[PDB]
Amino acid sequence: KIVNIGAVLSTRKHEQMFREAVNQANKRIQLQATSVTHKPNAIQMALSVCEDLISSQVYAILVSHTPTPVSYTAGFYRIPVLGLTTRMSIYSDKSIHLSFLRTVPPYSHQSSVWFEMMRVYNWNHIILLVSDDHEGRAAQKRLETLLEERESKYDNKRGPKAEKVLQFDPGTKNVTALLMEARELEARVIILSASEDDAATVYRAAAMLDMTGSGYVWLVGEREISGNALRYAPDGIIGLQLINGKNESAHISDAVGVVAQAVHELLEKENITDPPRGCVGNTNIWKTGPLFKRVLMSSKYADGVTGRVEFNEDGDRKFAQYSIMNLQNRKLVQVGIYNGTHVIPNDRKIIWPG
Amino acid sequence: SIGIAVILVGTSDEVAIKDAHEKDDFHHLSVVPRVELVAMNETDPKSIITRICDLMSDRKIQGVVFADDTDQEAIAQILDFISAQTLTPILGIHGGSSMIMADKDESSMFFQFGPSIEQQASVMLNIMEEYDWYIFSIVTTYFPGYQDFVNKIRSTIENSFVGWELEEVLLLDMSLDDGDSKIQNQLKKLQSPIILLYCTKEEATYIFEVANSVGLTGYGYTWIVPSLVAGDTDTVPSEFPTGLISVSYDEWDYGLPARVRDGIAIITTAASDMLSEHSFIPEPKSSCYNTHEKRIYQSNMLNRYLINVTFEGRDLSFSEDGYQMHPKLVIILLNKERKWERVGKWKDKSLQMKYYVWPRMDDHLSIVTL
Amino acid sequence: IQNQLKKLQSPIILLYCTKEEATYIFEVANSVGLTGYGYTWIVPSLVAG
Amino acid sequence: GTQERVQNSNKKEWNGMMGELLSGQADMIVAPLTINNERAQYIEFSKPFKY
Ligand SMILES: *[C@@H]1O[C@H](CO)[C@@H](O)[C@H](O)[C@H]1NC(C)=O
């Protein structure tokens, strides 16, 4: 009885790191490695994985760049998954994927950079914008979920305001009127977290009517400060990015390490039946699939390359790090953020719009 | 070109044979349904897609009807995934592939049978009203949905001139094993007659086992629960007390034949309207996965004309999101026989109960006037 | 007992018990949570003694 | 200003004047405007500029 593990998609530059990690275990329960490359027209990509990975009685699955029905399939049989490099928050749910256990912050949870970039300068007035899709709808729900706090339990303390939000479609058409409802208001702190192709269109339509001058203060999210954003935006913005980001291998080590760190805590339950071997012809459930998925919610080792791996209640990465960006004429300055939880300054030339 | 099928998969109800040809008014839909009624054995996701796609590429079915008999709460999403890049209207019917699934992609066309939690909550309010006691505290767990559950009350507890009230909207947290001193202490602060709930069976038995240790399960209060505790409708974990009311519907109303007749009627009435409003019909695509050249093609928008359609009779209208517009549910009182009765029915904002006055499980009397 | 006395409302409560009996009844009270601020039990010497 | 449950949806909505403010249209209401218990919930009033 040797335990196995396998990748999913284009991790071709990593086929040796997993094996080196596997060797790095019994010298730190026989272990191996396998992999496959994804293919277009994902319909067969769903089927093409079972008789190769769910055949060998797998114990985990590792994906990369829209993760396939590996989100769905491994849920059947209840195979715990620890994916990566995927962002769209739809996987936040606990009832659309039985064990999706991500290792990033999902683009919603980047709320608290804002609420920690505003409650240090004593501002209290805002506006907001989101576009008709689930991700921001969560981000909207996220932001309106936190601002209830900071209330008076210390002995008559007060907090900020949550002025009239807006809504709009993915926006093939003009946005003026919607914006026209916002101009005459009495605030400037604007947020807008939709997407690259959305941000470009909205800036392209917003620079026409001069609501985009001085006094305004923008705190924009990740996928709106890149792509076509640099082709149409006027500067002053405060963009966000992660300290590892779109990378290759700074993280498979963390994956396999969290995997291996629990195997000693598993083998003392006298109920260590495996998941079945062979995708075709299975109708039961490995009665320790959700259990093996849940006990990973307590893996505590900081020795990762990007150390301190620890998953939130939703099982996504917690206590991450970001990069407080900024756009000048064409430059992109940086200051370091949170030290994990606080705020720390770094000498640079902060300008405001105008 | 549009094939139509019925695919019962692995149960004890191979009954759909002698009944699918009493719908002979579909020549008014000007299309003949290629009614292939395959019936597969027990099927696994590999085999699931195997059979489904083999048929969709040979029997070439441009609208299907599923059924199953199991507590597998994920199968429907697999078809949703199939329906996405294949563009297939699909109607999961029996318990299982028709269970409540909240958020799917925006491009597919896969629908279902059963009530979304919005209706499954509004009927709760109509129950409370009809018998003249007005809403009291809510109790909740972190299971997904609540951020869309409490809103449906707090947008109907208000837009009604009647005298609603409210109590402490609690919010627990369970899977911490060190905070057992922080759940009993959270549920020891309720003094109201009626109490909702929204959780899953694992947390359900746990709360009731700890609630019974708080003073809220015996005589005087009447816990009510939506359909998620309405699962395997034969269980009585000892911590459950009597009187527990709910709402659901599994089989007592419509049998599989008319149910699958319901489905064939739906799909064929759809095949009527668009193909009678116009004269353009979908195309026989080559394959579902191994095209390798037919991943790039055009798409059509029939998935709009399946909203306002009936059975030449009762309203079988459908949403754009997907659930039965005016669904047919029941109401069940957990008897002291450890079974589940039938003490109501709902249709177009109505309530009719086998009881006039609610019974007990005598400070209540009955006096006569003139 | 755990549910027999949960309809008490009056901001005062008397009592008559003994030490271990008292401790049990008080743990029950906490498990129902009806001994916070406002209720003021009043017990004779057999608990003081 | 009253609370008329307009048809086609049994939902409360203020009407005319006392609703022209809460709808963000108006900014301030100087009038013979009365002081009941109903309106005092949503909008805040001055002191009594008469009796
Ligand atoms: C982060 O900064 C805070 C500021 O007080 C301080 O505690 C420490 O320098 C850093 N670490 C933590 C854990 O706060």
mmCIF file of N, CA and C in Angstrom, chain B residues 77-157:
data_model
loop_
_atom_site.group_PDB
_atom_site.id
_atom_site.type_symbol
_atom_site.label_atom_id
_atom_site.label_comp_id
_atom_site.label_asym_id
_atom_site.label_seq_id
_atom_site.Cartn_x
_atom_site.Cartn_y
_atom_site.Cartn_z
ATOM 1 N N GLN B 77 -25.237 19.066 -11.430
ATOM 2 C CA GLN B 77 -24.197 19.960 -11.906
ATOM 3 C C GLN B 77 -23.390 19.347 -13.034
ATOM 4 N N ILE B 78 -23.220 18.027 -13.040
ATOM 5 C CA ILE B 78 -22.456 17.415 -14.114
ATOM 6 C C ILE B 78 -23.165 17.624 -15.440
ATOM 7 N N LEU B 79 -24.483 17.435 -15.459
ATOM 8 C CA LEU B 79 -25.227 17.733 -16.673
ATOM 9 C C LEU B 79 -25.160 19.211 -17.014
ATOM 10 N N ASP B 80 -25.296 20.081 -16.010
ATOM 11 C CA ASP B 80 -25.131 21.509 -16.260
ATOM 12 C C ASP B 80 -23.842 21.770 -17.015
ATOM 13 N N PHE B 81 -22.757 21.140 -16.574
ATOM 14 C CA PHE B 81 -21.494 21.217 -17.291
ATOM 15 C C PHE B 81 -21.624 20.681 -18.708
ATOM 16 N N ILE B 82 -22.317 19.555 -18.883
ATOM 17 C CA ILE B 82 -22.541 19.036 -20.229
ATOM 18 C C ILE B 82 -23.356 20.025 -21.046
ATOM 19 N N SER B 83 -24.479 20.477 -20.495
ATOM 20 C CA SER B 83 -25.348 21.412 -21.190
ATOM 21 C C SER B 83 -24.638 22.692 -21.596
ATOM 22 N N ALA B 84 -23.589 23.089 -20.879
ATOM 23 C CA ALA B 84 -22.939 24.361 -21.167
ATOM 24 C C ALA B 84 -22.357 24.377 -22.572
ATOM 25 N N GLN B 85 -21.332 23.565 -22.815
ATOM 26 C CA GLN B 85 -20.662 23.569 -24.104
ATOM 27 C C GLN B 85 -21.361 22.694 -25.130
ATOM 28 N N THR B 86 -22.451 22.041 -24.759
ATOM 29 C CA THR B 86 -23.241 21.314 -25.736
ATOM 30 C C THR B 86 -24.553 22.009 -26.060
ATOM 31 N N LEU B 87 -24.983 22.960 -25.226
ATOM 32 C CA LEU B 87 -26.218 23.720 -25.432
ATOM 33 C C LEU B 87 -27.433 22.788 -25.481
ATOM 34 N N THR B 88 -27.691 22.159 -24.334
ATOM 35 C CA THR B 88 -28.753 21.167 -24.199
ATOM 36 C C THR B 88 -29.700 21.521 -23.063
ATOM 37 N N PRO B 89 -30.950 21.895 -23.340
ATOM 38 C CA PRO B 89 -31.956 21.967 -22.271
ATOM 39 C C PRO B 89 -32.106 20.605 -21.610
ATOM 40 N N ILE B 90 -32.110 20.594 -20.284
ATOM 41 C CA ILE B 90 -32.134 19.363 -19.510
ATOM 42 C C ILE B 90 -33.046 19.572 -18.314
ATOM 43 N N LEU B 91 -33.770 18.526 -17.931
ATOM 44 C CA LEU B 91 -34.767 18.603 -16.870
ATOM 45 C C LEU B 91 -34.591 17.426 -15.922
ATOM 46 N N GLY B 92 -33.802 17.615 -14.866
ATOM 47 C CA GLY B 92 -33.714 16.609 -13.818
ATOM 48 C C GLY B 92 -35.023 16.551 -13.060
ATOM 49 N N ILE B 93 -35.504 15.342 -12.791
ATOM 50 C CA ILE B 93 -36.861 15.139 -12.302
ATOM 51 C C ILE B 93 -36.879 14.521 -10.916
ATOM 52 N N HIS B 94 -36.449 13.274 -10.792
ATOM 53 C CA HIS B 94 -36.656 12.617 -9.514
ATOM 54 C C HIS B 94 -35.666 13.149 -8.485
ATOM 55 N N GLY B 95 -35.981 12.909 -7.211
ATOM 56 C CA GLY B 95 -35.124 13.287 -6.101
ATOM 57 C C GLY B 95 -33.688 12.869 -6.327
ATOM 58 N N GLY B 96 -32.755 13.800 -6.169
ATOM 59 C CA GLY B 96 -31.425 13.574 -6.685
ATOM 60 C C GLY B 96 -31.077 14.669 -7.664
ATOM 61 N N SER B 97 -31.020 14.331 -8.950
ATOM 62 C CA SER B 97 -30.613 15.270 -9.988
ATOM 63 C C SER B 97 -31.520 16.487 -10.094
ATOM 64 N N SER B 98 -32.536 16.577 -9.239
ATOM 65 C CA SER B 98 -33.404 17.745 -9.188
ATOM 66 C C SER B 98 -33.270 18.511 -7.876
ATOM 67 N N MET B 99 -32.336 18.115 -7.013
ATOM 68 C CA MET B 99 -32.160 18.801 -5.742
ATOM 69 C C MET B 99 -31.734 20.250 -5.967
ATOM 70 N N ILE B 100 -31.795 21.033 -4.896
ATOM 71 C CA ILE B 100 -31.590 22.476 -4.982
ATOM 72 C C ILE B 100 -30.121 22.750 -5.282
ATOM 73 N N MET B 101 -29.859 23.392 -6.415
ATOM 74 C CA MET B 101 -28.523 23.816 -6.805
ATOM 75 C C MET B 101 -28.546 25.303 -7.128
ATOM 76 N N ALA B 102 -27.741 26.078 -6.404
ATOM 77 C CA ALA B 102 -27.966 27.517 -6.341
ATOM 78 C C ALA B 102 -27.478 28.259 -7.582
ATOM 79 N N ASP B 103 -26.172 28.247 -7.831
ATOM 80 C CA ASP B 103 -25.552 29.165 -8.779
ATOM 81 C C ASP B 103 -24.797 28.386 -9.844
ATOM 82 N N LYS B 104 -25.297 28.428 -11.069
ATOM 83 C CA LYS B 104 -24.654 27.795 -12.208
ATOM 84 C C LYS B 104 -24.202 28.871 -13.188
ATOM 85 N N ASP B 105 -23.550 28.435 -14.261
ATOM 86 C CA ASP B 105 -23.031 29.365 -15.250
ATOM 87 C C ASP B 105 -24.170 30.103 -15.947
ATOM 88 N N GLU B 106 -23.803 31.150 -16.682
ATOM 89 C CA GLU B 106 -24.800 31.998 -17.315
ATOM 90 C C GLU B 106 -25.137 31.565 -18.733
ATOM 91 N N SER B 107 -24.405 30.606 -19.294
ATOM 92 C CA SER B 107 -24.588 30.249 -20.695
ATOM 93 C C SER B 107 -25.463 29.020 -20.898
ATOM 94 N N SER B 108 -25.519 28.123 -19.921
ATOM 95 C CA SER B 108 -26.213 26.859 -20.096
ATOM 96 C C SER B 108 -27.727 27.060 -20.092
ATOM 97 N N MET B 109 -28.454 25.941 -20.137
ATOM 98 C CA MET B 109 -29.911 25.956 -20.193
ATOM 99 C C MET B 109 -30.534 24.869 -19.325
ATOM 100 N N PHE B 110 -29.776 24.322 -18.388
ATOM 101 C CA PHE B 110 -30.238 23.198 -17.591
ATOM 102 C C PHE B 110 -31.141 23.677 -16.465
ATOM 103 N N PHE B 111 -32.343 23.114 -16.380
ATOM 104 C CA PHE B 111 -33.352 23.513 -15.401
ATOM 105 C C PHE B 111 -33.625 22.350 -14.453
ATOM 106 N N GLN B 112 -34.666 22.476 -13.640
ATOM 107 C CA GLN B 112 -34.888 21.494 -12.588
ATOM 108 C C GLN B 112 -36.360 21.476 -12.207
ATOM 109 N N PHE B 113 -36.697 20.588 -11.271
ATOM 110 C CA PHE B 113 -37.969 20.579 -10.563
ATOM 111 C C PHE B 113 -37.717 20.708 -9.072
ATOM 112 N N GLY B 114 -38.554 21.498 -8.417
ATOM 113 C CA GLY B 114 -38.426 21.702 -6.999
ATOM 114 C C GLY B 114 -38.389 23.163 -6.625
ATOM 115 N N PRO B 115 -38.549 23.442 -5.337
ATOM 116 C CA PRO B 115 -38.625 24.827 -4.878
ATOM 117 C C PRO B 115 -37.280 25.386 -4.450
ATOM 118 N N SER B 116 -36.989 26.591 -4.930
ATOM 119 C CA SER B 116 -35.867 27.336 -4.393
ATOM 120 C C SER B 116 -36.228 27.873 -3.014
ATOM 121 N N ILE B 117 -35.196 28.192 -2.230
ATOM 122 C CA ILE B 117 -35.408 28.537 -0.830
ATOM 123 C C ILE B 117 -36.256 29.787 -0.659
ATOM 124 N N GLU B 118 -36.396 30.603 -1.705
ATOM 125 C CA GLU B 118 -37.285 31.757 -1.627
ATOM 126 C C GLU B 118 -38.729 31.322 -1.407
ATOM 127 N N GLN B 119 -39.249 30.464 -2.284
ATOM 128 C CA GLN B 119 -40.605 29.965 -2.095
ATOM 129 C C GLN B 119 -40.700 29.111 -0.843
ATOM 130 N N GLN B 120 -39.692 28.271 -0.614
ATOM 131 C CA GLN B 120 -39.656 27.426 0.567
ATOM 132 C C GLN B 120 -39.556 28.230 1.853
ATOM 133 N N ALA B 121 -39.332 29.535 1.764
ATOM 134 C CA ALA B 121 -39.439 30.410 2.919
ATOM 135 C C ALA B 121 -40.748 31.170 2.953
ATOM 136 N N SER B 122 -41.212 31.659 1.808
ATOM 137 C CA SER B 122 -42.461 32.409 1.793
ATOM 138 C C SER B 122 -43.628 31.557 2.272
ATOM 139 N N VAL B 123 -43.635 30.270 1.924
ATOM 140 C CA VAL B 123 -44.713 29.431 2.428
ATOM 141 C C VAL B 123 -44.647 29.350 3.946
ATOM 142 N N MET B 124 -43.447 29.423 4.520
ATOM 143 C CA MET B 124 -43.332 29.488 5.973
ATOM 144 C C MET B 124 -44.116 30.668 6.527
ATOM 145 N N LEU B 125 -43.946 31.838 5.916
ATOM 146 C CA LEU B 125 -44.670 33.009 6.384
ATOM 147 C C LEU B 125 -46.170 32.837 6.223
ATOM 148 N N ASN B 126 -46.612 32.262 5.106
ATOM 149 C CA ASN B 126 -48.048 32.071 4.945
ATOM 150 C C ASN B 126 -48.615 31.105 5.975
ATOM 151 N N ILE B 127 -47.868 30.061 6.337
ATOM 152 C CA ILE B 127 -48.292 29.206 7.440
ATOM 153 C C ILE B 127 -48.444 30.016 8.709
ATOM 154 N N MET B 128 -47.394 30.738 9.100
ATOM 155 C CA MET B 128 -47.471 31.489 10.348
ATOM 156 C C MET B 128 -48.647 32.449 10.350
ATOM 157 N N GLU B 129 -48.938 33.066 9.207
ATOM 158 C CA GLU B 129 -50.043 34.016 9.154
ATOM 159 C C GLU B 129 -51.381 33.314 9.320
ATOM 160 N N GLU B 130 -51.656 32.315 8.475
ATOM 161 C CA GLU B 130 -52.976 31.693 8.446
ATOM 162 C C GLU B 130 -53.446 31.257 9.825
ATOM 163 N N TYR B 131 -52.531 30.890 10.716
ATOM 164 C CA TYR B 131 -52.922 30.435 12.040
ATOM 165 C C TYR B 131 -52.642 31.466 13.116
ATOM 166 N N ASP B 132 -52.320 32.694 12.726
ATOM 167 C CA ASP B 132 -52.391 33.849 13.614
ATOM 168 C C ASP B 132 -51.406 33.741 14.781
ATOM 169 N N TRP B 133 -50.156 33.453 14.443
ATOM 170 C CA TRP B 133 -49.020 33.796 15.286
ATOM 171 C C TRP B 133 -47.945 34.384 14.392
ATOM 172 N N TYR B 134 -47.267 35.408 14.888
ATOM 173 C CA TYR B 134 -46.455 36.249 14.027
ATOM 174 C C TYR B 134 -44.976 36.068 14.331
ATOM 175 N N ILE B 135 -44.161 36.154 13.269
ATOM 176 C CA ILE B 135 -42.787 35.651 13.205
ATOM 177 C C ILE B 135 -42.001 35.979 14.456
ATOM 178 N N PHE B 136 -41.238 35.019 14.920
ATOM 179 C CA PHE B 136 -40.328 35.240 16.017
ATOM 180 C C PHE B 136 -38.944 34.774 15.570
ATOM 181 N N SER B 137 -38.044 34.612 16.536
ATOM 182 C CA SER B 137 -36.608 34.573 16.283
ATOM 183 C C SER B 137 -36.219 33.629 15.152
ATOM 184 N N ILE B 138 -35.116 33.965 14.492
ATOM 185 C CA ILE B 138 -34.452 33.108 13.519
ATOM 186 C C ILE B 138 -33.200 32.551 14.187
ATOM 187 N N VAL B 139 -32.816 31.331 13.827
ATOM 188 C CA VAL B 139 -31.559 30.734 14.264
ATOM 189 C C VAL B 139 -30.901 30.115 13.042
ATOM 190 N N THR B 140 -29.582 30.256 12.930
ATOM 191 C CA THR B 140 -28.901 29.966 11.677
ATOM 192 C C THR B 140 -27.503 29.423 11.958
ATOM 193 N N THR B 141 -26.953 28.709 10.977
ATOM 194 C CA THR B 141 -25.561 28.281 10.965
ATOM 195 C C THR B 141 -24.867 28.829 9.726
ATOM 196 N N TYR B 142 -23.558 28.638 9.680
ATOM 197 C CA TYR B 142 -22.750 29.206 8.617
ATOM 198 C C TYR B 142 -22.878 28.462 7.304
ATOM 199 N N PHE B 143 -23.750 27.468 7.222
ATOM 200 C CA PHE B 143 -23.922 26.755 5.970
ATOM 201 C C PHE B 143 -24.373 27.725 4.884
ATOM 202 N N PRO B 144 -23.900 27.558 3.656
ATOM 203 C CA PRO B 144 -24.215 28.528 2.604
ATOM 204 C C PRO B 144 -25.706 28.690 2.385
ATOM 205 N N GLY B 145 -26.094 29.920 2.056
ATOM 206 C CA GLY B 145 -27.474 30.278 1.793
ATOM 207 C C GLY B 145 -28.019 31.396 2.658
ATOM 208 N N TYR B 146 -27.613 31.477 3.932
ATOM 209 C CA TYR B 146 -28.270 32.389 4.867
ATOM 210 C C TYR B 146 -28.255 33.825 4.370
ATOM 211 N N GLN B 147 -27.160 34.243 3.736
ATOM 212 C CA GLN B 147 -27.072 35.587 3.192
ATOM 213 C C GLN B 147 -28.045 35.798 2.042
ATOM 214 N N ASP B 148 -28.803 34.772 1.667
ATOM 215 C CA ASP B 148 -29.949 34.922 0.788
ATOM 216 C C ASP B 148 -31.233 34.427 1.431
ATOM 217 N N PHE B 149 -31.161 33.917 2.657
ATOM 218 C CA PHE B 149 -32.350 33.506 3.386
ATOM 219 C C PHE B 149 -32.927 34.644 4.210
ATOM 220 N N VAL B 150 -32.108 35.273 5.059
ATOM 221 C CA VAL B 150 -32.644 36.320 5.927
ATOM 222 C C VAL B 150 -33.180 37.498 5.130
ATOM 223 N N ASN B 151 -32.642 37.729 3.934
ATOM 224 C CA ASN B 151 -33.124 38.820 3.097
ATOM 225 C C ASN B 151 -34.555 38.587 2.629
ATOM 226 N N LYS B 152 -34.924 37.336 2.333
ATOM 227 C CA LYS B 152 -36.267 37.077 1.827
ATOM 228 C C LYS B 152 -37.325 37.315 2.891
ATOM 229 N N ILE B 153 -36.985 37.135 4.165
ATOM 230 C CA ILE B 153 -37.894 37.564 5.219
ATOM 231 C C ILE B 153 -37.856 39.079 5.369
ATOM 232 N N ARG B 154 -36.663 39.653 5.512
ATOM 233 C CA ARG B 154 -36.585 41.085 5.768
ATOM 234 C C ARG B 154 -36.970 41.932 4.567
ATOM 235 N N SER B 155 -37.434 41.322 3.479
ATOM 236 C CA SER B 155 -38.129 42.043 2.421
ATOM 237 C C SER B 155 -39.583 41.612 2.298
ATOM 238 N N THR B 156 -40.075 40.811 3.242
ATOM 239 C CA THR B 156 -41.494 40.503 3.357
ATOM 240 C C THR B 156 -42.022 40.688 4.766
ATOM 241 N N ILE B 157 -41.157 40.691 5.779
ATOM 242 C CA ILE B 157 -41.551 41.094 7.124
ATOM 243 C C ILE B 157 -41.962 42.552 7.188
#
